[PDB]
Amino acid sequence: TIASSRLRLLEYSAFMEVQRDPDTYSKHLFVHIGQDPPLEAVDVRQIYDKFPEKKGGLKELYEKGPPNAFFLVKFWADLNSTIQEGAFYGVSSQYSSADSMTISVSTKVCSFGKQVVEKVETEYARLENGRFVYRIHRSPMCEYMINFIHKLKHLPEKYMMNSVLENFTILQVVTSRDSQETLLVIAFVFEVSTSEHGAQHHVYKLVKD
Ligand SMILES: NC[C@@]1(c2ccccc2)Cc2c(ccc(Cl)c2-c2ccccc2C(N)=O)O1
Ligand SMILES: *C(=O)CCCCCCCCCCCCC
């Protein structure tokens, strides 16, 4: 469970979809976080080098606080060609909060500690069972990401894929749109899954000392 005092990530999944015929659709999940155990900590200074720094960087974000909003997710992405591929590469996520506020989700793709792509999406709360729910449904992946996945899929060894992924990170920062107050920050780090049970993940809490 990834949750700060203000926002809670409910679900997250990056996937691809193909239309085998007009009545058949196939969906492969690269990564997934479905719907509270204690979390193991990771010192934030160990990841600084691979995230974007200076003005608006992760070090300035952490210093600004609150620290209860920072998390690290290690992903073991399933890049196995389990379906044949006009394919849709997308990302679906969902959050919840006790307060009604408009959120802003920014996704920073980084290569060698330098921001290459950024995507900003404002999300409005929807009242549901006494809580506020934010839904991002089938947000298409940018061609940078689709091409990156194709390039990784073309490497002959999984160790080669993991070496490229050593200098690739995605930083997700959710802020209250109007106040600009940090609600949730999730640093995503990746490896290619070698498991027979597919995509795996591990959550950690980002700490300083
Ligand atoms: N293959 C190693 C790893 C990994 C391993 C398994 C699953 C996902 C990723 C660790 C890792 C990356 C990429 C970027 C970072 Cl920032 C990290 C990382 C994570 C925690 C602390 C320090 C660092 C670091 N700076 O290396 O790939
Ligand atoms: C906008 O393009 C944000 C895209 C975030 C994609 C999540 C990455 C999931 C695919 C796993 C491939 C291996 C590591 C990128």
Describe the structure.
- It is a single chain.
- This protein is mainly β.
- It is built from 3 helices and 12 strands, in the order E-E-E-H-E-E-E-E-E-E-H-H-E-E-E.
- It has one domain: Distorted Sandwich (Coagulation Factor XIII, Chain A, domain 1), CATH 2.70.50.
- Strand 8 and strand 9 form a beta hairpin.
- It is globular and about 45 Å long.
- The chain starts with 7 loop residues before the first strand and ends with a strand.
- The longest helix is centred in the C-terminal third of the chain and has 11 residues.
- The structure holds ligand KMU and myristic acid (MYR).
- The site of the ligand NC[C@@]1(c2ccccc2)Cc2c(ccc(Cl)c2-c2ccccc2C(N)=O)O1 has 15 residues, from strand 4 and strand 11.
- Myristic acid binds next to strand 2 and helix 2.
- This is Transcriptional enhancer factor TEF-5.
- It comes from Mus musculus (Mouse).
- It is found in: Nucleus.
- Interacts with YAP1 and WWTR1/TAZ.
Give the number of helices.
3
- Oligomer status: monomer
**Main sheet?**
7 strands, mixed
Judging by the overall fold, what is the CATH architecture? Distorted Sandwich
Give the names of the bound compounds: ligand KMU, myristic acid
Structural class by SSE content: mainly beta
What is the C-alpha radius of gyration, as a whole number of Å?
A: 17 Å
Integer tally of domains: 1
Shape category = globular
Supply the CATH class.
Mainly Beta
CATH topology tier name: Coagulation Factor XIII, Chain A, domain 1
Strand order of the largest sheet: 3-12-4-11-10-6-7
- How far apart the termini lie comes to 22 Å
Strand count = 12
- How large is the share of residues in beta strands? over 45%
Region (Transcriptional activation): 1-209
Organism: Mus musculus (Mouse)
Protein name: Transcriptional enhancer factor TEF-5
Subcellular location: Nucleus
